[PDB]
Scaffold this active site. Structure first.
Site, PDB file in Angstrom:
ATOM      1  N   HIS A 248       7.660 -16.425  14.674  1.00  0.00           N
ATOM      2  CA  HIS A 248       7.444 -16.326  16.110  1.00  0.00           C
ATOM      3  C   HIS A 248       5.937 -16.280  16.384  1.00  0.00           C
ATOM      4  CE1 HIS A 248       7.434 -14.643  20.169  1.00  0.00           C
ATOM      5  NE2 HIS A 248       8.658 -15.134  20.306  1.00  0.00           N
TER       6      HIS A 248
ATOM      7  N   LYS B 182       4.969 -19.131  21.633  1.00  0.00           N
ATOM      8  CA  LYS B 182       3.727 -18.651  22.183  1.00  0.00           C
ATOM      9  C   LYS B 182       3.903 -18.340  23.655  1.00  0.00           C
ATOM     10  CE  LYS B 182      -0.953 -18.844  22.147  1.00  0.00           C
ATOM     11  NZ  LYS B 182      -1.730 -17.862  21.293  1.00  0.00           N
TER      12      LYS B 182
ATOM     13  N   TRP C 201       2.137 -18.692  26.458  1.00  0.00           N
ATOM     14  CA  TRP C 201       1.095 -19.385  27.207  1.00  0.00           C
ATOM     15  C   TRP C 201       1.648 -20.696  27.680  1.00  0.00           C
ATOM     16  CZ3 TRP C 201      -2.908 -16.652  28.625  1.00  0.00           C
ATOM     17  CH2 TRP C 201      -3.940 -17.280  29.310  1.00  0.00           C
TER      18      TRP C 201
ATOM     19  N   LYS D 186      -7.351 -19.909  36.087  1.00  0.00           N
ATOM     20  CA  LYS D 186      -8.298 -20.673  36.938  1.00  0.00           C
ATOM     21  C   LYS D 186      -8.343 -20.183  38.382  1.00  0.00           C
ATOM     22  CE  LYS D 186      -8.663 -23.099  33.233  1.00  0.00           C
ATOM     23  NZ  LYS D 186      -7.442 -22.336  32.630  1.00  0.00           N
TER      24      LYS D 186
ATOM     25  N   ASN E 166      10.314 -15.894  30.037  1.00  0.00           N
ATOM     26  CA  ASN E 166      10.958 -15.058  29.040  1.00  0.00           C
ATOM     27  C   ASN E 166      11.692 -13.899  29.696  1.00  0.00           C
ATOM     28  OD1 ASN E 166      11.386 -14.171  26.264  1.00  0.00           O
ATOM     29  ND2 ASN E 166      10.053 -12.433  26.837  1.00  0.00           N
ATOM     30  N   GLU E 167      12.919 -13.629  29.238  1.00  0.00           N
ATOM     31  CA  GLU E 167      13.761 -12.514  29.709  1.00  0.00           C
ATOM     32  C   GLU E 167      13.582 -12.197  31.200  1.00  0.00           C
ATOM     33  OE1 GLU E 167      13.510  -9.389  26.886  1.00  0.00           O
ATOM     34  OE2 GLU E 167      14.382 -10.665  25.325  1.00  0.00           O
TER      35      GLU E 167
ATOM     36  N   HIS F 177      18.446 -14.640  23.257  1.00  0.00           N
ATOM     37  CA  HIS F 177      17.908 -13.779  22.217  1.00  0.00           C
ATOM     38  C   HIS F 177      19.039 -12.972  21.612  1.00  0.00           C
ATOM     39  CE1 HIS F 177      13.829 -13.851  24.491  1.00  0.00           C
ATOM     40  NE2 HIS F 177      14.162 -15.008  23.962  1.00  0.00           N
TER      41      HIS F 177
ATOM     42  N   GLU G 114      14.540 -15.956  19.995  1.00  0.00           N
ATOM     43  CA  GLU G 114      14.258 -14.765  19.196  1.00  0.00           C
ATOM     44  C   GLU G 114      15.561 -14.283  18.577  1.00  0.00           C
ATOM     45  OE1 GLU G 114      12.593 -11.570  21.547  1.00  0.00           O
ATOM     46  OE2 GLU G 114      11.417 -12.921  22.772  1.00  0.00           O
TER      47      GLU G 114
ATOM     48  N   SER H  74       6.326 -12.201  13.533  1.00  0.00           N
ATOM     49  CA  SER H  74       5.233 -12.963  14.067  1.00  0.00           C
ATOM     50  C   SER H  74       4.098 -13.208  13.083  1.00  0.00           C
ATOM     51  CB  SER H  74       4.789 -12.389  15.399  1.00  0.00           C
ATOM     52  OG  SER H  74       4.323 -11.064  15.238  1.00  0.00           O
TER      53      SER H  74
HETATM   54  C1  LIG Z   1       8.111 -10.575  23.683  1.00  0.00           C
HETATM   55  O1  LIG Z   1       8.913  -9.275  23.318  1.00  0.00           O
HETATM   56  C2  LIG Z   1      10.251  -9.388  22.913  1.00  0.00           C
HETATM   57  C3  LIG Z   1      11.170  -9.674  24.088  1.00  0.00           C
HETATM   58  O2  LIG Z   1      11.045 -11.052  24.565  1.00  0.00           O
HETATM   59  C4  LIG Z   1      12.639  -9.378  23.731  1.00  0.00           C
HETATM   60  O3  LIG Z   1      13.290 -10.324  22.994  1.00  0.00           O
HETATM   61  O4  LIG Z   1      12.791  -8.082  23.182  1.00  0.00           O
HETATM   62  C5  LIG Z   1      12.050  -8.019  21.879  1.00  0.00           C
HETATM   63  C6  LIG Z   1      12.320  -6.795  20.929  1.00  0.00           C
HETATM   64  O5  LIG Z   1      12.164  -7.259  19.517  1.00  0.00           O
HETATM   65  C7  LIG Z   1      10.560  -8.065  22.258  1.00  0.00           C
HETATM   66  O6  LIG Z   1      10.233  -6.984  23.153  1.00  0.00           O
HETATM   67  O7  LIG Z   1       7.538 -11.114  22.517  1.00  0.00           O
HETATM   68  C8  LIG Z   1       6.526 -10.325  21.880  1.00  0.00           C
HETATM   69  C9  LIG Z   1       5.913 -11.315  20.863  1.00  0.00           C
HETATM   70  O8  LIG Z   1       5.146 -10.574  19.927  1.00  0.00           O
HETATM   71  S1  LIG Z   1       4.213 -11.367  19.007  1.00  0.00           S
HETATM   72  O9  LIG Z   1       4.894 -12.583  18.642  1.00  0.00           O
HETATM   73  O10 LIG Z   1       3.944 -10.432  17.928  1.00  0.00           O
HETATM   74  O11 LIG Z   1       3.013 -11.666  19.837  1.00  0.00           O
HETATM   75  C10 LIG Z   1       5.431  -9.821  22.827  1.00  0.00           C
HETATM   76  O12 LIG Z   1       4.642 -10.912  23.329  1.00  0.00           O
HETATM   77  C11 LIG Z   1       3.242 -10.717  23.231  1.00  0.00           C
HETATM   78  O13 LIG Z   1       2.892 -10.059  24.429  1.00  0.00           O
HETATM   79  C12 LIG Z   1       1.495  -9.743  24.450  1.00  0.00           C
HETATM   80  C13 LIG Z   1       1.197  -8.846  25.629  1.00  0.00           C
HETATM   81  O14 LIG Z   1       2.002  -7.698  25.548  1.00  0.00           O
HETATM   82  C14 LIG Z   1       0.662 -11.019  24.489  1.00  0.00           C
HETATM   83  O15 LIG Z   1       0.912 -11.728  25.712  1.00  0.00           O
HETATM   84  C15 LIG Z   1       1.082 -11.857  23.272  1.00  0.00           C
HETATM   85  O16 LIG Z   1       0.493 -13.139  23.295  1.00  0.00           O
HETATM   86  C16 LIG Z   1      -0.911 -13.173  23.094  1.00  0.00           C
HETATM   87  O17 LIG Z   1      -1.526 -13.202  24.385  1.00  0.00           O
HETATM   88  C17 LIG Z   1      -2.915 -13.555  24.356  1.00  0.00           C
HETATM   89  C18 LIG Z   1      -3.648 -12.622  23.412  1.00  0.00           C
HETATM   90  O18 LIG Z   1      -3.476 -13.262  22.132  1.00  0.00           O
HETATM   91  C19 LIG Z   1      -2.789 -14.509  22.276  1.00  0.00           C
HETATM   92  C20 LIG Z   1      -1.305 -14.280  22.146  1.00  0.00           C
HETATM   93  O19 LIG Z   1      -0.589 -15.468  22.423  1.00  0.00           O
HETATM   94  C21 LIG Z   1      -3.068 -14.907  23.705  1.00  0.00           C
HETATM   95  O20 LIG Z   1      -4.426 -15.353  23.852  1.00  0.00           O
HETATM   96  C22 LIG Z   1      -4.645 -16.169  24.993  1.00  0.00           C
HETATM   97  O21 LIG Z   1      -4.517 -17.471  24.473  1.00  0.00           O
HETATM   98  C23 LIG Z   1      -4.809 -18.462  25.462  1.00  0.00           C
HETATM   99  C24 LIG Z   1      -4.552 -19.839  24.855  1.00  0.00           C
HETATM  100  O22 LIG Z   1      -3.209 -19.970  24.449  1.00  0.00           O
HETATM  101  C25 LIG Z   1      -6.235 -18.282  26.004  1.00  0.00           C
HETATM  102  O23 LIG Z   1      -7.187 -18.541  24.988  1.00  0.00           O
HETATM  103  C26 LIG Z   1      -6.440 -16.860  26.536  1.00  0.00           C
HETATM  104  O24 LIG Z   1      -7.792 -16.634  26.890  1.00  0.00           O
HETATM  105  C27 LIG Z   1      -8.040 -16.586  28.302  1.00  0.00           C
HETATM  106  O25 LIG Z   1      -7.917 -17.944  28.732  1.00  0.00           O
HETATM  107  C28 LIG Z   1      -8.981 -18.831  28.190  1.00  0.00           C
HETATM  108  C29 LIG Z   1      -8.773 -20.194  28.802  1.00  0.00           C
HETATM  109  O26 LIG Z   1      -7.452 -20.621  28.492  1.00  0.00           O
HETATM  110  S2  LIG Z   1      -6.740 -21.561  29.346  1.00  0.00           S
HETATM  111  O27 LIG Z   1      -7.747 -22.608  29.688  1.00  0.00           O
HETATM  112  O28 LIG Z   1      -6.199 -20.946  30.598  1.00  0.00           O
HETATM  113  O29 LIG Z   1      -5.650 -22.128  28.496  1.00  0.00           O
HETATM  114  C30 LIG Z   1     -10.403 -18.284  28.476  1.00  0.00           C
HETATM  115  O30 LIG Z   1     -10.671 -18.273  29.903  1.00  0.00           O
HETATM  116  C31 LIG Z   1     -10.531 -16.847  27.923  1.00  0.00           C
HETATM  117  O31 LIG Z   1     -11.822 -16.336  28.244  1.00  0.00           O
HETATM  118  C32 LIG Z   1      -9.442 -15.972  28.544  1.00  0.00           C
HETATM  119  O32 LIG Z   1      -9.539 -14.663  27.961  1.00  0.00           O
HETATM  120  C33 LIG Z   1      -6.053 -15.853  25.471  1.00  0.00           C
HETATM  121  O33 LIG Z   1      -6.040 -14.563  26.023  1.00  0.00           O
HETATM  122  C34 LIG Z   1       2.593 -12.086  23.263  1.00  0.00           C
HETATM  123  O34 LIG Z   1       3.003 -12.914  22.172  1.00  0.00           O
HETATM  124  C35 LIG Z   1       6.127  -9.120  24.054  1.00  0.00           C
HETATM  125  O35 LIG Z   1       5.143  -8.644  24.984  1.00  0.00           O
HETATM  126  C36 LIG Z   1       7.096 -10.119  24.706  1.00  0.00           C
HETATM  127  O36 LIG Z   1       7.736  -9.572  25.877  1.00  0.00           O
END
Ligand SMILES: *[C@@]1(O[C@@H]2[C@@H](O)[C@@H](O)O[C@H](CO)[C@@H]2O)O[C@@H](COS(=O)(=O)O)[C@@H](O[C@@H]2O[C@H](CO)[C@H](O)[C@H](O[C@@H]3O[C@H]4CO[C@@H]([C@@H]3O)[C@@H]4O[C@@H]3O[C@H](CO)[C@H](O)[C@H](O[C@@H]4O[C@@H](COS(=O)(=O)O)[C@@H](O)[C@@H](O)[C@@H]4O)[C@H]3O)[C@H]2O)[C@@H](O)[C@@H]1O
Ligand SMILES: [Ca+2]
Ligand SMILES: [Cl-]
Ligand SMILES: [K+]
Ligand SMILES: [K+]
Length: 565
Positions: free
Chosen positions: A28, A51, A53, A62, A126-127, A210, A248, A294
């Site tokens: 994942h 992912k 995003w 934006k 998601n959910e 899921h 999931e 993950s």
């Molecule tokens: C879910 O949880 C599960 C439930 O769905 C359900 O089934 O019950 C389950 C019980 O088992 C469970 O609760 O899945 C989880 C997944 O875990 S993981 O796989 O271990 O990650 C969780 O999901 C995570 O949630 C967190 C927040 O809580 C977070 O959202 C996780 O994803 C991440 O988010 C950010 C931080 O790291 C990256 C991960 O994907 C991501 O980075 C972003 O990446 C983008 C590009 O893809 C950008 O770079 C972004 O930066 C910003 O944007 C850029 C420009 O980008 S763009 O042009 O717009 O594209 C710049 O401007 C930059 O400066 C700016 O900062 C960057 O942050 C997520 O996986 C549970 O929370 C979820 O419910």
């Protein structure tokens, strides 16, 4: 109990025999650009992924306003497809009351059609429905569930009507967190997944859920019923099933928070195995499945979380307060992937007399793989039978992955001098036998499923229910009825069952546990019977319960027929 393998008979799930590893052996994640994750993927032969995003997180980044979209830099070149699922959190930044749903849908198509690389799967929210009453939403409850479904529908419609994306991206939904179809006397089914299928399903390529065990188990008969209901209604609505996506699957350990622990957080591995065998048997109607394990999940490792890792993480940093320089440790979840490493090939025929013992077998050239999983709560001895007395098989290695809730994972690989006569398998143990095989296929057997025009029927005492089926190719082989019921736990699970008028024995046992700790039993009970009772074309199944209440959710006939080809 017995299991029989015939490596001289190739087995098909409708049109496919080969195991598609990319449908199962995934993480994942999309962090293949991480050196440690990328190395793991190659070493263990693992794919992607998922992912959080997408167009809505990109757009909000934006415009900083929900429902308002930037202009996409025009791009008219080639679009390549990366295999993963893009999903979005159901945040107020992404969806909100008053949103222009047609514009939201148009934006997904504009964002992706002007991208050089798109996900194979888009799963818009998601959910979503469990968040429909979140305080920040200006529309809530049923009205918000309906808005979320309209958001999905618009996205599917717009993507499919864009010739640059149509056929390349598949739209799936609704990423169901809580597939309690039976709740409220099936009111839950009616107002969640049925409503989704009715209102957005025409615009979806497939349906996603899921699947989790509490550590209350969905593995075994409940998950089987959950997925059978989706298929059964899709057949009624569309005239054919649509593919499933299990975005999931795993276990949730019941912990005051979501922090990683080396013992508790590996308990999920047994759930990965228990669900895997169900999903392997659905390959012909499965886009993808994703074990909920993950990556480094660095986003979790914060002061606010006391620098703990997320429970689902695969890698744990040696020094959580120096993430730039720390080494990273691959945790024991790796053994799930070790157990299945190199497993591939064409399915071969295999049966199991005990529904708690799940069995798979694959033949890849000169290698044979045989897998067993125990869904029961007692150890079981399984006699392994082969019509050729394994004459063509040699160099047997036994892999074993045992998950003990206090001790963690015990993984072993042992050479053994012959295929075993019988195997003892304990609860939460999965075994993969790997051997050389020198044999060629003398027959094939093709598994087809047949769906009824009748589903979701309320049960009354002594009142027969009739389920018609059409288009059946009968022959020689095996057959079974997949009978799914939702009833109070005390209600009978032993109806009289007739196949074209002939009463057949209903088993006492089904896959996995009895659901005694649930108020409502919701599960699929298999009823094997002689294929010779089936006719070509129309068939009927009639069932009668001695007591009232609950529903028959779905009735599906499975036929495994000997075929040339
Ligand atoms: C879910 O949880 C599960 C439930 O769905 C359900 O089934 O019950 C389950 C019980 O088992 C469970 O609760 O899945 C989880 C997944 O875990 S993981 O796989 O271990 O990650 C969780 O999901 C995570 O949630 C967190 C927040 O809580 C977070 O959202 C996780 O994803 C991440 O988010 C950010 C931080 O790291 C990256 C991960 O994907 C991501 O980075 C972003 O990446 C983008 C590009 O893809 C950008 O770079 C972004 O930066 C910003 O944007 C850029 C420009 O980008 S763009 O042009 O717009 O594209 C710049 O401007 C930059 O400066 C700016 O900062 C960057 O942050 C997520 O996986 C549970 O929370 C979820 O419910
Ligand atoms: Ca059982
Ligand atoms: Cl809900
Ligand atoms: K992409
Ligand atoms: K749900």
């Amino acid at each position: 109990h017995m299991a029989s393998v015939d490596y001289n008979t190739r087995r098909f799930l409708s049109g496919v025999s080969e195991l598609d590893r990319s449908k199962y052996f995934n993480i994942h994640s999309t962090s293949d650009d991480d050196k440690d994750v990328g190395k793991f993927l190659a070493d263990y032969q693992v794919g992607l992924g998922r992912k959080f995003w997408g167009p809505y997180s990109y757009a909000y980044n934006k415009t900083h306003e929900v429902g308002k979209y930037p202009q996409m830099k025009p791009y008219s070149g080639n679009i390549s497809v990366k295999r993963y699922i893009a999903t979005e959190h159901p945040y107020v930044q992404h969806i909100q009351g008053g949103i222009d749903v047609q514009a939201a849908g148009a934006w997904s198509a504009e964002y992706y059609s002007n991208s050089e690389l798109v996900p194979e799967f888009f799963e818009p929210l998601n959910e979503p429905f469990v968040h429909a009453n979140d305080a920040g939403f200006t529309v809530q409850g049923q009205a918000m569930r309906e808005l979320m479904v309209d958001f999905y529908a618009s996205i599917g419609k717009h993507i499919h009507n864009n010739p640059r994306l149509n056929g390349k991206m598949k739209v799936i939904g609704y990423a169901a967190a809580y597939p309690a179809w039976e709740d409220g006397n099936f009111n839950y089914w009616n107002t969640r997944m049925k409503m989704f299928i009715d209102r957005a399903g025409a615009y979806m390529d497939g349906f996603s859920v899921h699947l989790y065990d509490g550590i209350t188990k969905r593995s075994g008969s409940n998950s089987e019923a959950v997925l059978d209901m989706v298929e059964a209604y899709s057949y009624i609505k569309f005239g054919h099933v649509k593919p499933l996506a299990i975005s999931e699957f795993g276990g949730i350990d019941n912990k005051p928070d979501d922090s990683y622990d080396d013992i508790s957080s590996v308990r999920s591995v047994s759930s990965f195995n228990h669900f895997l065998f169900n999903l392997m048997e659905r390959q012909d109607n499965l886009f993808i499945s994703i074990p909920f394990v993950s990556d480094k999940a660095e986003w979790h490792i914060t002061a606010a979380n006391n620098y703990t890792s997320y429970s689902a993480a695969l890698f744990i940093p040696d020094n959580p307060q120096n993430l730039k320089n720390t080494t990273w440790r691959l945790n024991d979840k790796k053994y799930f992937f070790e157990l299945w490493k190199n497993v591939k090939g064409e399915r071969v025929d295999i049966t199991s007399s005990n529904p708690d013992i799940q069995v798979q077998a694959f033949k890849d050239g000169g290698r044979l793989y045989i897998a067993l999983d125990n869904l029961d709560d007692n150890p079981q001895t399984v006699y392994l039978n082969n019509k050729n007395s394994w004459k063509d098989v040699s160099n047997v290695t036994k892999r074993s992955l045992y998950v003990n809730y206090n001790a963690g994972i015990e993984y072993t690989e042992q050479n053994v001098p012959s295929m075993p006569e019988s195997i003892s398998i304990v609860p939460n143990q999965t075994i993969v036998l790997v051997a050389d095989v020198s044999s060629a296929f003398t027959n094939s057997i093709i598994r087809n499923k047949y769906y009824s025009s009748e589903y979701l029927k309320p049960i009354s005492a002594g009142s027969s229910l009739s389920f018609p089926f059409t288009g059946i190719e009968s022959g020689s082989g095996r057959a079974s009825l997949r009978m799914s019921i939702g009833r109070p736990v005390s209600a009978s699970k032993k109806p009289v069952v007739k196949i074209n008028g002939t009463a057949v024995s209903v088993p006492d046992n089904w896959k996995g546990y009895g659901q005694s700790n649930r108020n409502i039993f919701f599960g699929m009970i298999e009823v094997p019977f002689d294929i010779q009772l089936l006719k070509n074309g129309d068939n009927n199944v009639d069932i009668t319960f001695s007591d009232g209440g609950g529903h028959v959710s779905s009735m599906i006939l499975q036929v495994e027929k000997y075929t040339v080809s």
